[PDB]
Design a protein around this ligand. Sequence first.
Ligand SMILES: *CCC(=O)Nc1cnc2ccccc2c1
Ligand SMILES: *CCC(=O)Nc1cnc2ccccc2c1
Ligand SMILES: N[C@@H](Cc1c[nH]c[nH+]1)C(=O)O
Ligand SMILES: N[C@@H](Cc1c[nH]c[nH+]1)C(=O)O
Lengths: 418, 418
Amino acid sequence: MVETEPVQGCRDFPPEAMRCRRHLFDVFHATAKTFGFEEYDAPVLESEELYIRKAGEEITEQMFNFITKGGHRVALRPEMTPSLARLLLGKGRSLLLPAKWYSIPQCWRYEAITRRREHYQWNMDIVGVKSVSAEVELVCAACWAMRSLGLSSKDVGIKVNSRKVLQTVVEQAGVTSDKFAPVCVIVDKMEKIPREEVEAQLAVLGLEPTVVDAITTTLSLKSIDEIAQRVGEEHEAVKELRQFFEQVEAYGYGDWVLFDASVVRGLAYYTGIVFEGFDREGKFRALCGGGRYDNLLTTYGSPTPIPCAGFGFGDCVIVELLQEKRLLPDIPHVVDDVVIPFDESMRPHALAVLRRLRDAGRSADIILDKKKVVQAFNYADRVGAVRAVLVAPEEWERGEVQVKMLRRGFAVPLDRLV
Amino acid sequence: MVETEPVQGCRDFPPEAMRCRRHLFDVFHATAKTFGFEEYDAPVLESEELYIRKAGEEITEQMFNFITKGGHRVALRPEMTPSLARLLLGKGRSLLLPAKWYSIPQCWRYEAITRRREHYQWNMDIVGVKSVSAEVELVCAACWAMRSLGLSSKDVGIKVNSRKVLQTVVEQAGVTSDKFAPVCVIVDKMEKIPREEVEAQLAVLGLEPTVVDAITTTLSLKSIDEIAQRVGEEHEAVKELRQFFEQVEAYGYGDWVLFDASVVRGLAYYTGIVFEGFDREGKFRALCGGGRYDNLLTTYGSPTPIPCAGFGFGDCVIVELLQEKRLLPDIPHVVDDVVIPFDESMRPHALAVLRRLRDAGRSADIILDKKKVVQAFNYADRVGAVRAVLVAPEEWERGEVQVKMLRRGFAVPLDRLV
Ligand SMILES: *CCC(=O)Nc1cnc2ccccc2c1
Ligand SMILES: *CCC(=O)Nc1cnc2ccccc2c1
Ligand SMILES: N[C@@H](Cc1c[nH]c[nH+]1)C(=O)O
Ligand SMILES: N[C@@H](Cc1c[nH]c[nH+]1)C(=O)O
């Protein structure tokens, strides 16, 4: 007896579960199409060199990696953004900007807590757009998908902030910019852990209380006005946030978005606006997350800087949420027609009827093994047949077949079936 | 400058290539729906124990495997069928038969020839059907997909045979059935390599010339009648083949299928009918391949035998074929509308028009960065916009917007856009 359970921390998708998965993914695809993005994909396997960012990120701590027999260090992608940029660099100047690329890759992490080791992540990125109009498009896409699954501005939101704010606090206070990204990582873990633990974890990177307290204060500012008092309306993070909120208002999604100076995200490459989907009952971790990352491509060796922004939207939390709101009922399998031979002698004919139904775009099954009509009808019910088509010898001589709608069973000519 | 090329032997799918991939996969999905199959999926990662079959198969010689840090021996699936059976066993008696399951998994092999290490394989299996009516359904599905891509009975075919034929030759000649599966593996490599090399490779497994010559002769029989002379019409492989050909005839695909006693397939678990898609110009390797495998589930420790049959249909050869026949032209990207602000002051309004178009199911982009109208029109062309919608201040005061079909530019009220 072989092991039926899957590999540690992975998921099987038998039909029922796969229909839930499809319900979700169809939304990601439709939203992408609505917003005008183009699909792409890259190998699940990447060179390990692609991810070592030296910022102390939780994503680079828990990487599912190994060695090919041929010696090359490779990894199951923990995320898609580095792969995207690998494609964008490959294209060079034959890349046409602006580009709006999306994908639904499965991504992989490794842990000792026997926790999931995989998830599917919708990725949406806009490449080659300087202005916050891209973030606006991105957030609006996030919200569209959410409403498409049947969530409202009363159920979820999008918290927004800009790392440029903290960028200045750290620059003015006298800390070399190399220390910045690792700080964002530490400051991102604020609600999750104590306050004295963060300040000690910051102090470890060579930062005195004056410099640390400035950081504490600026995360717990509640408005843009308060950000303005702290760094002026002159500040570009302020103009960007104002423009961002103005454009999302105009698009019609003002009720979905709000400012939150605590939001930094845990990844290193974000440089400007950042955002984080959340549920309004405070029950769940983030629904999705993204931001602007203007330097990643410079860092990958692009001769000229390429502005980007995008987000990830995982398959785990959104499902947990939809399930709580009872917006993910099991959809049962359907099929238009189940062709039923009265007996084996009728099989050849039933096969020609089966041909016609399919030829006309209908979905159809035919009873495969020898079985009684009554068992065949039971089978039709089980598989969600809208209609049973009985093929009996008597009707066949007349050029007819019996048809029963499942939601007597009337005689019908061949030609009127379709 | 980071490495832009992907990992050895894998493929990137930037937008253009991904549209080809989608063209193909949409066919696999539609054919599956037409034939009434249900989608499933399992982890790309499986325990290594799942594949060691001891038959000398080329698939188990070239397996892309490695060790998790946690010690477990795991592998990137070289095929889907063992994973399917893992799911089917997990379900036990809550599995409803007959079951018609399909999937489009990426599968992985390892080689020293720096050759592809991955492909996408459409898998279609019917579970819980004793009679050849399943193989009929399977082959007909194979052909449907092929015609759906625009191939004809004049371009490709399906060669059919039954391993039960060789089963008897080997049994009558006095060879323990353990030697059978390894023979099928060797006999499958017949066209690819010399004849004396196969007979020496057979002799290595403890088989004298009398027993070997029987095998040689029975592969090069050209008709079913000749199979009948050799093993009688009594024989069930003969009744099965006759029934198979009769049912495919009746379905309307007689011209696509033909008998070929050389066909055995290279995998161990096939027990009855087997089949192999081929192109009629003799140019390419197999388009797809499948068969009946009635014992795999017994072998996996099922308390009672579960009859199955199915096939694999890869993404490599079919593409090569379609490309030769010029049936895979690059489909360029489209989008319904590109909303164009006359200038930045018009952006808020353009965003509300963008809302309306999307709200109505249209796909739409909006000019994201600051740019001239003329550049905006050039952009609209590039991305396959069917229609440009210019939003100017003069028209806006009237409650109008300018609309230009891209395959003057007339004024239109907001409400008539959609
Ligand atoms: C329920 C939340 C969850 O499973 N999240 C998750 C799973 N797997 C990965 C793999 C790689 C990166 C992130 C995640 C997140
Ligand atoms: C062009 C044919 C081809 O690439 N075939 C192929 C590629 N990759 C795999 C991986 C696993 C098993 C089979 C194949 C076949
Ligand atoms: N890869 C990021 C999401 C993202 C896409 N684009 C920018 N950020 C994440 O894992 O959260
Ligand atoms: N897994 C088989 C195809 C198959 C599916 N079902 C039965 N056979 C192959 O790799 O060729």
